[PDB]
Amino acid sequence: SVWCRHCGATSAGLRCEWQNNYTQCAPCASLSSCPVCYRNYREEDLILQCRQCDRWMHAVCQNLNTEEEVENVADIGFDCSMCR
Amino acid sequence: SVWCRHCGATSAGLRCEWQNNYTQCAPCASLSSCPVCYRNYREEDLILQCRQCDRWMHAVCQNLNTEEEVENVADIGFDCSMCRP
Amino acid sequence: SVWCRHCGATSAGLRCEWQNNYTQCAPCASLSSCPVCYRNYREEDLILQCRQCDRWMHAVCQNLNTEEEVENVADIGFDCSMCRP
Amino acid sequence: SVWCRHCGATSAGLRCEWQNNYTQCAPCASLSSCPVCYRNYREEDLILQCRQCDRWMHAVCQNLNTEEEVENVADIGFDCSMCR
Amino acid sequence: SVWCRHCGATSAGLRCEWQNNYTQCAPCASLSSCPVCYRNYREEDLILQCRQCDRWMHAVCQNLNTEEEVENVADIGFDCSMCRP
Amino acid sequence: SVWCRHCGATSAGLRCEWQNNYTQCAPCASLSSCPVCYRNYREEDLILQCRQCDRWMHAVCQNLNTEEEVENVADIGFDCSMCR
Amino acid sequence: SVWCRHCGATSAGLRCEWQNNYTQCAPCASLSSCPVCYRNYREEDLILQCRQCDRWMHAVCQNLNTEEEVENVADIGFDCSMCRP
Amino acid sequence: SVWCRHCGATSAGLRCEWQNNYTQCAPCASLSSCPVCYRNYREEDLILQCRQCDRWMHAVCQNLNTEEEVENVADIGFDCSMCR
Amino acid sequence: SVWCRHCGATSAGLRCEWQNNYTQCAPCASLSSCPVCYRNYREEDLILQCRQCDRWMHAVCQNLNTEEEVENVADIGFDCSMCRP
Amino acid sequence: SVWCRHCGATSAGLRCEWQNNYTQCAPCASLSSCPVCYRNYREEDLILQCRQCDRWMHAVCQNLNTEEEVENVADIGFDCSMCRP
Amino acid sequence: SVWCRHCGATSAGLRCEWQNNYTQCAPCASLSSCPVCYRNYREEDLILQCRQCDRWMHAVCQNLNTEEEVENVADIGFDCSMCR
Amino acid sequence: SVWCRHCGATSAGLRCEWQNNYTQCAPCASLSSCPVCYRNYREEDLILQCRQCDRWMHAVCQNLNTEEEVENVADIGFDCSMCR
Amino acid sequence: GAKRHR
Amino acid sequence: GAKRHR
Amino acid sequence: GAKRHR
Amino acid sequence: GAKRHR
Amino acid sequence: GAKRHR
Amino acid sequence: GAKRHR
Ligand SMILES: [Zn+2]
Ligand SMILES: [Zn+2]
Ligand SMILES: [Zn+2]
Ligand SMILES: [Zn+2]
Ligand SMILES: [Zn+2]
Ligand SMILES: [Zn+2]
Ligand SMILES: [Zn+2]
Ligand SMILES: [Zn+2]
Ligand SMILES: [Zn+2]
Ligand SMILES: [Zn+2]
Ligand SMILES: [Zn+2]
Ligand SMILES: [Zn+2]
Ligand SMILES: [Zn+2]
Ligand SMILES: [Zn+2]
Ligand SMILES: [Zn+2]
Ligand SMILES: [Zn+2]
Ligand SMILES: [Zn+2]
Ligand SMILES: [Zn+2]
Ligand SMILES: [Zn+2]
Ligand SMILES: [Zn+2]
Ligand SMILES: [Zn+2]
Ligand SMILES: [Zn+2]
Ligand SMILES: [Zn+2]
Ligand SMILES: [Zn+2]
Ligand SMILES: [Zn+2]
Ligand SMILES: [Zn+2]
Ligand SMILES: [Zn+2]
Ligand SMILES: [Zn+2]
Ligand SMILES: [Zn+2]
Ligand SMILES: [Zn+2]
Ligand SMILES: [Zn+2]
Ligand SMILES: [Zn+2]
Ligand SMILES: [Zn+2]
Ligand SMILES: [Zn+2]
Ligand SMILES: [Zn+2]
Ligand SMILES: [Zn+2]
Ligand SMILES: [Zn+2]
Ligand SMILES: [Zn+2]
Ligand SMILES: [Zn+2]
Ligand SMILES: [Zn+2]
Ligand SMILES: [Zn+2]
Ligand SMILES: [Zn+2]
């Protein structure tokens, strides 16, 4: 299993049905595919989380090209291009 | 105990920590309190859920006062004022 | 039974599912209820149809109160306030 | 015949006369030609439907170049460039 | 019978079909009714013609109330509120 | 002669004096020269009419490069770049 | 007879035709009537001249009511509301 | 001498002192130099007059490259890029 | 003496000179006085801290009147009106 | 005689001609009269100086009414309403 | 010495302390360095003064490349790109 | 030790916990990494401080490429691209 | 709505 | 929401 | 409205 | 706030 | 309004 | 207002 950060439970990690039985919330959807480029993440993709829209996305899809850049903006507070 | 629509689990019902230890995701926070007026919901409150930001909110905080109006906006999909440019 | 202007068929008159199973297209929803005020139409209501979004709506919800004004905007083609930038 | 998703009937699928006897609604028109590039669809064109304007359009005309991209944005909720 | 300023002909005075069979051009429609308030003109009405959209309209629907004001805006060329960004 | 679509008469098709004795309306002017590029039309120029400003213009001056594109947008309702 | 500041000539004082036979330039029209309210000037009127559009206009139509305010805006150069973005 | 189109007199055609004794109005200044590129006109420069700001300017400085283009826009009513 | 959250030091509590000798950083200035109304705080004042500009400010100067509203905006992260476009 | 802060000289105190013979620079003009309301200052007037345009102006013409508010905006650096986009 | 155009005095031409003892007004600062490119002027740099912000700046930093251009815009009234 | 310019004390110069125990203020964060490019500063990086947002940043990340440019804008009052 | 100029 | 045209 | 400069 | 997808 | 820097 | 990082 995994922990769900939304409810704190040990979880099967089922598809989100927050929006409707067929529709994830954008935050849950953003765990599996990038909301910028709409590609499924590949194992080892560098991703970070916007503090506004609560979505994960590719660092490269926000012109963050290194771990160093990703750590610096994530540390101080990351506001993605979509929310700016 | 509470059903988590995000993962399917039954939970003791703990504070969302999706954003971080100190921060609920906006959708989880919107279950308990309106993201427009920042007030806790009443049992009596008409609420609806934006298809663009996934947040619940007071019908009245979007100028929708009746089940008639709420029903009517769900027929087409609700885009809240905060998501509309 | 109802005439569908979209396909020409006579139908039992079922909920539009053009968008999906849960969602009417905005034009079909606008037959029964105003896309500005989200209220069901009256028999007495003056309504008109936007050439840009294909939606019906209350004349009054576009500040047109009379058959005179409605007739006059149809002479040139109605662009609703929601379609005007 | 086909089913019409607007009325639910089995249908001849006549030209839409929603706007006037000579004029389709933009949603019905968008089944046969792209509202971005104004080209008739070719058999096997990848198309998706905006949840706002209810129109179909070419994936490539929205910079969605794969089935993977099209499935991801259609799943979470597709808002086309025209409606944004 | 009517003089057509567009082509010079004398005509029985038929509905403009410049846009299509169902639609007058906006300039022709503006002869009979105001493109701001969508009301038919009075004999008494002060009207003026925009140099940018070629439409006639009520002086009052552009906040010009007198022959003095209308005369004054024609001296320089009238750009209507709908044409001004 | 021709028919004038404004008045419905058989007509000499004189220069428009709608704006003043020396000045056409933009719709009448747009029959002889393009309001985008300001070139006189050449015989066989593909042109279409905006439903907003009532002007004709070159298809190519609106990035419509084929009869197919011109028919599709003219059919559903053409709103030119100037009026958008 | 009138001094033309544009060319230096003394003239019988004829309608400006700089724009065309039917149209004064906006600066010449602004001598006789306000380009904001489109009213002919009074002898009593405080007027000032924009450095950006070269037009005269009522001080009051720019919310300047006194010789004090007019004097003060000339010290720095007057940019009228119609020229300010 | 010349005629002044402002006053209708036969005129020496002195420098304009409309703005102040040292300063032309922009319309008078625009007879001798282009308000787009700020170059003195050369003999035979193709120029046209905006109906809004009353200034002359180079046709080429408004992407009008032929007499044909200049005649067409001047005829129907020329609104320069500065005034749009 | 005062705890400096910026560096961890205990200090006599001297004017911030982060910007320069004459200028506190906006976050340090916001400890003593509201960056919206420019008034010194009361003991009684509800204040909150923007996550985008790091400034403290009156809840009331952001239209938040109660501990309920303040508590509710901290659950999700406060973006002040001056940081919102 | 007057101290010129611009050059350090003592002067008889002559009209600024920095812009030209007819025009003070906006900062020099702002010594004698408010660039917002275009009124000469009172002895009693609270004034402050924008760090972005170098102009003096009435505190009240920027909605600052007290020495408390003026003192508070100087702590961080005053950006006037005319310089703020 | 020089004359100061601000006060009319014969002057040492000290650093401006209008903003504070350490800070020039932008007009005085603009006599020694360009407010566009932030380069110290070099002897013979062609510069002109905006009638709005009262600053001097390089002609080339406003796409004015000749004395002819500089004289024409300065004569009629120069409004720099920053103030437009 | 160092002096802290915020409090005036001799200081260990601990990580800022102004925003929360885990989160710096953007001004303190900007001492160690650039708020434009999100790179850790390298020894000898030319940096300057915006008078608005109180952050340090790379001169090169504001198109200031020399000490001369940096001194000129810092002297008169530096308003960074983010705050404009 | 669409023609060739002739 | 997504198909191939046929 | 249009001329050559002379 | 930042991870590698696994 | 225009000079060379000297 | 301006330094080299050290
Ligand atoms: Zn959550
Ligand atoms: Zn869960
Ligand atoms: Zn991506
Ligand atoms: Zn975001
Ligand atoms: Zn979810
Ligand atoms: Zn609410
Ligand atoms: Zn929303
Ligand atoms: Zn249809
Ligand atoms: Zn309604
Ligand atoms: Zn519409
Ligand atoms: Zn439908
Ligand atoms: Zn049907
Ligand atoms: Zn396409
Ligand atoms: Zn759409
Ligand atoms: Zn005509
Ligand atoms: Zn009217
Ligand atoms: Zn108009
Ligand atoms: Zn017509
Ligand atoms: Zn006719
Ligand atoms: Zn063309
Ligand atoms: Zn058009
Ligand atoms: Zn003149
Ligand atoms: Zn007036
Ligand atoms: Zn003006
Ligand atoms: Zn004139
Ligand atoms: Zn004259
Ligand atoms: Zn030119
Ligand atoms: Zn113009
Ligand atoms: Zn700090
Ligand atoms: Zn306050
Ligand atoms: Zn803030
Ligand atoms: Zn100075
Ligand atoms: Zn004042
Ligand atoms: Zn200012
Ligand atoms: Zn001065
Ligand atoms: Zn001096
Ligand atoms: Zn420069
Ligand atoms: Zn300037
Ligand atoms: Zn500080
Ligand atoms: Zn400290
Ligand atoms: Zn950097
Ligand atoms: Zn900044």
Q: Which amino acid is residue D37, in one-letter code?
A: C
Closest C-alpha among C70, H23, E16 to residue F8: E16
- Cβ burial of I23 (10 Å; 0-12, 13-18, 19+) is buried
Residue of A nearest to P2 (CA): A48
| Residues A70 and L33: beta-carbon distance below 8 Å | no
Which chains form contacts with chain N, at 3 or more CB pairs under 8 Å? Answer: D
CA distance I27 to L7: 12
DSSP state of A26: H
CA distance F16 to D56: 42
DSSP result, K11-29: E--PPP-SSBTTB--HHHH
Expressed in angstroms, the distance from the first to the final Cα of chain Q is 15
CA distance N1 to D50: 8
Residue D60's contacts (CB-CB under 8 Å, 6 or more residues apart) are: D46
CA distance B31 to G25: 64
Closest C-alpha among D54, D65, D58 to residue D26: D54
For strand I2-3 and strand F56-58, is the pairing parallel, antiparallel, or unpaired?
Answer: unpaired
- Give the residue carrying structure tokens 């008469």: F9
CA distance N4 to D46: 5
**Chain Cα centroid distance, residue G32:** 8
Q: Which amino acid is residue K10, in one-letter code?
A: T
| Residues D8 and C14: beta-carbon distance below 8 Å | yes
Residue G24: list chain E partners with CB under 8 A: 75-76
| Residues E1 and E12: beta-carbon distance below 8 Å | yes
CA distance L4 to I4: 9
Instruction: Write the secondary structure of chain C as one string of H (helix), E (strand) and C (coil).
Output: CEECCCCCCEECCCCCCCCECCECCHHHHCCCECCCCCCECCCCCCEEECCCCCCEEECHHHCCCCHHHHHHHHCCCCCCCCCCC
Question: How many inter-chain contacts (H to K, CB under 8 Å) are there?
Answer: 26
**Chain Cα centroid distance, residue B17:** 17
CA distance A53 to A50: 6
CA distance D39 to D15: 18
CA distance A9 to B14: 8
CA distance L29 to E61: 57
- Cβ burial of C60 (10 Å; 0-12, 13-18, 19+) is middle
Closest C-alpha among F27, K29, G35 to residue J52: K29
Closest C-alpha among K78, A79, E40, L11 to residue C69: E40
Where does D12-84 have alpha helices with state H?
A: 26-29, 67-76
- Between CA E80 and CA F55, with CA C77 as vertex, the angle to 5 degrees is 65
Element (H, E) at I58: strand I56-58
Expressed in angstroms, the distance from the first to the final Cα of chain E is 39
Residue F35's contacts (CB-CB under 8 Å, 6 or more residues apart) are: F26, F29, F53, F55, F56, F57, F82, H76
DSSP state of G70: H
CA distance C47 to A14: 46
DSSP result, I25-41: -HHHHTTTB-TTT--BP
Residue D51: list chain B partners with CB under 8 A: 51, 77
Expressed in angstroms, the distance from the first to the final Cα of chain C is 39
Q: SS3 of F10, please?
A: strand
CA distance H44 to H23: 26
Cβ of K64 within 8 Å of Cβ of H33? The answer is no
Q: How far is the CA of D3 from the centre of ligand 36 (A)?
A: 86
Residues within 5 A (CB) of ion ligand 5: A 16, 18, 25, 28; B 6
CA distance B59 to B65: 6
| Residues D52 and D5: beta-carbon distance below 8 Å | no
Residue G40's contacts (CB-CB under 8 Å, 6 or more residues apart) are: E68, E72, G32, G33
Residue F64: list chain D partners with CB under 8 A: 38
Tokens of K27: 């007009």
Rg for chain G (alpha carbons), in Å?
Answer: 14
Where does G1-85 have alpha helices with state H?
A: 26-29, 67-74
Q: Which amino acid is residue G85, in one-letter code?
A: P
Closest C-alpha among H73, C85, D53 to residue F83: C85
Question: E strands along E1-85, which residues?
Answer: 2-3, 10-11, 47-49, 56-58
Q: Which amino acid is residue H19, in one-letter code?
A: Q
Cβ of H72 within 8 Å of Cβ of F24? The answer is no
DSSP state of A61: G
In 10 A of CB J3, how many CB atoms?
13
Element (H, E) at F3: strand F2-3
| Residues D49 and D55: beta-carbon distance below 8 Å | yes
Residue B55's contacts (CB-CB under 8 Å, 6 or more residues apart) are: B26, B27, B30, B35, B49, B80, B82
- Between CA C1 and CA C10, with CA C6 as vertex, the angle to 5 degrees is 25
Residue Q3: list chain K partners with CB under 8 A: 47-48
CA distance J6 to H66: 53
Sign of CA dihedral H14, H20, H21, H23: negative
CA distance D26 to F58: 23
| Sheet order of strands, Q2-4 included | K56-58, K46-49, Q2-4
Where does J1-85 have alpha helices with state H?
A: 26-29, 67-74
CA distance C58 to K8: 70
| Residues F70 and M4: beta-carbon distance below 8 Å | no
Q: SS3 of L26, please?
A: helix
Q: Which domains does chain A have, with CATH numbers?
A: 17-76 (3.30.40.10)
CA distance H70 to H59: 7
For strand H10-11 and strand A10-11, is the pairing parallel, antiparallel, or unpaired?
Answer: unpaired
Closest C-alpha among C15, C73, C25, C66 to residue C49: C73
Backbone angles phi and psi of O4, in degrees to 5: -100, 135
Which chains form contacts with chain R, at 3 or more CB pairs under 8 Å? Answer: L
CA distance J61 to J34: 8
Length of chain I: 85
Closest C-alpha among I61, I60, I54 to residue I79: I54
CA distance F8 to D20: 22
| Residues E1 and F10: beta-carbon distance below 8 Å | no
DSSP state of A40: B
Q: SS3 of K10, please?
A: strand
Residue G68's contacts (CB-CB under 8 Å, 6 or more residues apart) are: J38, J39, J40
Q: Do chains O and F touch (3 or more CB pairs under 8 A)?
A: no
Q: Which method, experimentally, gave rise to this model?
A: X-ray
- Between CA H29 and CA H36, with CA H30 as vertex, the angle to 5 degrees is 120
In 10 A of CB E26, how many CB atoms?
24
Closest C-alpha among H49, H51, H53, H84 to residue H64: H49
- Give the residue carrying structure tokens 């027929």: B75
| Phi and psi based region of residue J54 (left: phi greater than 0; alpha: psi -120 to 50; beta: remaining) | left
Element (H, E) at B10: strand B10-11
Q: SS3 of L51, please?
A: coil
Dihedral angle, C-alpha K46, K49, K55, K60, nearest 10 °? -40
**Chain Cα centroid distance, residue G82:** 13
| Residues I34 and I41: beta-carbon distance below 8 Å | yes
Sign of CA dihedral K9, K12, K13, K17: negative
Backbone angles phi and psi of B29, in degrees to 5: -55, -40
Q: Measure CB to CB from residue H41 to each of O1, O2, O5 and give the nearest one.
A: O5
Closest C-alpha among L53, J72, J67 to residue I41: J72
In 10 A of CB I79, how many CB atoms?
18
Sign of CA dihedral I36, I37, I41, I42: negative
Cβ of M5 within 8 Å of Cβ of F78? The answer is no
Residue L20: list chain B partners with CB under 8 A: 22
| Residues L41 and I36: beta-carbon distance below 8 Å | no
Cα-based distances in Å from F75 to C42, D30, D47, D57, D80: 33, 12, 21, 17, 22
Residue of C nearest to F78 (CA): C52
Beta bridge partners of A48: A57, P2
Q: Which amino acid is residue H80, in one-letter code?
A: C
Cα-based distances in Å from D72 to A30, D23, D62, D65, E7: 10, 33, 13, 12, 57
How many CA within 13 A on the CB side of residue H36? Answer: 17
* Burial per residue of L4-29, b for 16 or more beta-carbon CB atoms within 10 angstroms, e otherwise: bbbbbbebebebbbbbeeebbbbbbb
- Between CA K55 and CA K64, with CA K59 as vertex, the angle to 5 degrees is 135
The experimental resolution of this structure, in angstroms, equals 1.8
Q: SS3 of F68, please?
A: helix
Q: Which amino acid is residue G36, in one-letter code?
A: V
Q: SS3 of Q4, please?
A: strand
Dihedral angle, C-alpha F41, F42, F48, F49, nearest 10 °? 30
Backbone angles phi and psi of C22, in degrees to 5: -105, -5
In 10 A of CB D42, how many CB atoms?
8
Length of chain R: 6
CA distance B49 to B58: 9
Residue B59's contacts (CB-CB under 8 Å, 6 or more residues apart) are: B45, B46, B47, B48, B65, B66, B69, B70
Residue C44's contacts (CB-CB under 8 Å, 6 or more residues apart) are: none
| Residues E41 and E55: beta-carbon distance below 8 Å | no
CA distance A27 to A43: 19
| Residues I69 and B38: beta-carbon distance below 8 Å | yes
Q: Measure CB to CB from residue G69 to each of J24, J32, J38 and give the nearest one.
A: J38
Q: Which of residues 60-79 of K touch I (CB under 8 A)?
A: none
Dihedral angle, C-alpha D73, D74, D76, D81, nearest 10 °? 60
CA distance B64 to J74: 45
Tokens of B6: 């995000």
- State the smallest CA–CA distance between residue R1 and chain L in angstroms: 5
CA distance H45 to L65: 42
- Give the residue carrying structure tokens 């002057």: K11
Q: How many helices (H) and strands (E) in chain G?
A: 2, 4
- Cβ burial of G81 (10 Å; 0-12, 13-18, 19+) is exposed
